[PDB]
Design an enzyme around this catalytic site. Structure first.
Site, PDB file in Angstrom:
ATOM      1  N   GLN A   1      34.315  61.572  58.777  1.00 41.65           N
ATOM      2  CA  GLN A   1      33.479  61.971  57.660  1.00 41.65           C
ATOM      3  C   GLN A   1      32.081  61.396  57.820  1.00 41.65           C
ATOM      4  O   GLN A   1      31.894  60.351  58.436  1.00 41.65           O
ATOM      5  CB  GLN A   1      34.095  61.512  56.343  1.00 41.65           C
ATOM      6  CG  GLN A   1      35.378  62.226  56.011  1.00 41.65           C
ATOM      7  CD  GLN A   1      36.192  61.523  54.972  1.00 41.65           C
ATOM      8  OE1 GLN A   1      36.714  60.444  55.197  1.00 41.65           O
ATOM      9  NE2 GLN A   1      36.353  62.159  53.833  1.00 41.65           N
ATOM     10  N   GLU A   2      31.099  62.114  57.275  1.00 39.10           N
ATOM     11  CA  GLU A   2      29.685  61.732  57.297  1.00 39.10           C
ATOM     12  C   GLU A   2      29.177  61.506  58.720  1.00 39.10           C
ATOM     13  O   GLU A   2      28.736  60.418  59.085  1.00 39.10           O
ATOM     14  CB  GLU A   2      29.434  60.499  56.422  1.00 39.10           C
ATOM     15  CG  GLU A   2      29.443  60.753  54.930  1.00 39.10           C
ATOM     16  CD  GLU A   2      28.128  61.324  54.423  1.00 39.10           C
ATOM     17  OE1 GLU A   2      27.895  62.533  54.593  1.00 39.10           O
ATOM     18  OE2 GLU A   2      27.324  60.565  53.842  1.00 39.10           O
ATOM     19  N   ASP A   3      29.258  62.575  59.514  1.00 38.02           N
ATOM     20  CA  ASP A   3      28.751  62.632  60.884  1.00 38.02           C
ATOM     21  C   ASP A   3      29.384  61.562  61.768  1.00 38.02           C
ATOM     22  O   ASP A   3      28.714  60.674  62.279  1.00 38.02           O
ATOM     23  CB  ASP A   3      27.223  62.513  60.914  1.00 38.02           C
ATOM     24  CG  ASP A   3      26.528  63.643  60.187  1.00 38.02           C
ATOM     25  OD1 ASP A   3      27.223  64.566  59.717  1.00 38.02           O
ATOM     26  OD2 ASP A   3      25.279  63.610  60.090  1.00 38.02           O
ATOM     27  N   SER A   4      30.693  61.655  61.932  1.00 34.89           N
ATOM     28  CA  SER A   4      31.430  60.761  62.804  1.00 34.89           C
ATOM     29  C   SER A   4      32.379  61.585  63.658  1.00 34.89           C
ATOM     30  O   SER A   4      32.600  62.765  63.407  1.00 34.89           O
ATOM     31  CB  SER A   4      32.175  59.702  62.003  1.00 34.89           C
ATOM     32  OG  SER A   4      32.913  58.864  62.852  1.00 34.89           O
TER      33      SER A   4
END
Ligand SMILES: [Zn+2]
Ligand SMILES: [Zn+2]
Lengths: 48, 261, 64
Positions: A1-4
């Site tokens: 999540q959130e650019d991972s």
């Protein structure tokens, strides 16, 4: 999540994105001066 | 300085930041640690006088002796750059010049003479000696003065220098004459054999070195004239003919095992 | 730099399949048929053989 990113452990074990990091350290013997020479030798604790 | 432990050295921990004892681990000391100016040009015009001149400039006194050392170092750098010396020889030259100037014995001679003499000494002490004529080419000073100054430097500063051998000049002479490696090895072997076998009593090493150059040159496809040899060595063509006519008997013995004649 | 011994995704051996693949390119076959002649059914191994650079051949040019 959130650019991972989730990565495959088995793939990484098989060489996925494995890499090396060469670093180089440079030193010179700057014997400039009257008696301020620095000869390359193994420094023992007796002198030095 | 550890309490309860007299005569104990302290390991200094530059990572942990302490001074620590290798018997009990106490800490002595709570933490570890670790002339002039120039006046430039004015930006605003408020510093200018009615005649200009900005009224604020650098007086640049800096003693006389420091001025003399600075001019001497400038002369050494611009002299050694002409023959392309590495900076280690330049720094050794500066070291010898500072020792001579603080020895206070050579005030009666031009600083430039002591400068070129220290250049010759530093070129000698690195095992890569230059001839006196090569120093004289890049210096405003005659060979007599540099010889006398070198004689006074060795007498005064109390040092010993190694005697020159022919093999030191061979690489510079061949490379500046643009000769290949086989010519280099053949000429060096000829020079060392002529020195050891004793054909040349009291002859200068520079003459027999250029003679070995002429040996290696006049045996292959490339050939060098007497004038070129004298140009690159500084010895006169008569001296080359003297060494030629005195080295010419017993020629194959001086040569190495294989040269491709 | 060199062909991997195993495919990263599945694990099929693709180290031994580089040279022959080059041979099938030297025998005027298309790359798809060359891959199909090796049994590389899944597209992971086709990614391995199809998109590989033999930089070790470039490195061998320099003196040791
Ligand atoms: Zn202690
Ligand atoms: Zn696969």
């Amino acid at each position: 999540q959130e650019d991972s990113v989730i990565m495959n452990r088995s793939a990484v074990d098989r060489g996925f994105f494995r890499s090396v990091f060469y670093r180089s350290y440079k030193e010179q013997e700057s014997k400039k001066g009257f008696d301020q020479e620095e000869v390359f030798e193994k420094p023992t604790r007796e002198t030095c | 300085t550890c309490p309860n432990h007299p005569d104990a050295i302290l390991v200094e921990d530059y990572r942990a930041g302490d001074m620590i004892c290798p018997e009990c681990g106490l800490v002595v000391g709570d933490r570890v640690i670790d002339l002039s100016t120039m006046i430039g040009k004015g930006t605003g015009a408020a510093s200018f006088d009615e005649f200009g001149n900005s009224k604020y400039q650098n007086r640049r006194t800096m003693s006389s002796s420091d001025r003399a050392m600075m001019n001497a170092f400038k002369e050494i750098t611009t002299m050694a750059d002409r023959i392309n010396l590495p900076r280690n020889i330049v720094d050794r030259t500066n070291n010898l010049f500072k020792q001579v100037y603080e020895q206070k014995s050579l005030k009666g001679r031009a600083n430039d003479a002591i400068a070129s003499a220290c250049l010759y000494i530093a070129c000698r002490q690195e095992g890569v000696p230059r001839t006196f004529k090569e120093i004289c080419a890049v210096s405003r000073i005659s060979k007599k003065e540099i010889g006398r100054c070198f004689k006074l430097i060795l007498k005064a500063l109390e040092t010993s220098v190694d005697l020159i051998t022919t093999g030191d000049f061979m690489s510079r002479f061949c490379s500046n004459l643009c000769l290949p490696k086989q010519v280099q090895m053949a000429a060096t072997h000829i020079a060392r054999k002529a020195v050891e076998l004793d054909l040349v009593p009291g002859r200068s090493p520079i003459s027999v070195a250029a003679a070995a150059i002429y040996m290696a040159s006049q045996a292959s496809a490339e050939k060098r004239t007497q004038k070129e040899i004298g140009d690159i060595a500084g010895v006169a063509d008569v001296t080359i003919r003297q060494s030629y006519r005195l080295i010419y008997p017993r020629a194959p013995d001086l040569f190495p095992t294989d040269f491709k004649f | 730099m060199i062909i991997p011994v195993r495919c990263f995704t599945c694990g099929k051996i693709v180290g031994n399949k580089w040279e022959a693949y080059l041979g099938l390119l030297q025998a005027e076959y298309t790359e798809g048929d060359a891959l199909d002649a090796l049994g590389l059914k899944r597209y992971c191994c086709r990614r391995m053989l199809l998109a590989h650079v033999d930089l070790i051949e470039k490195l061998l040019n320099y003196a040791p």
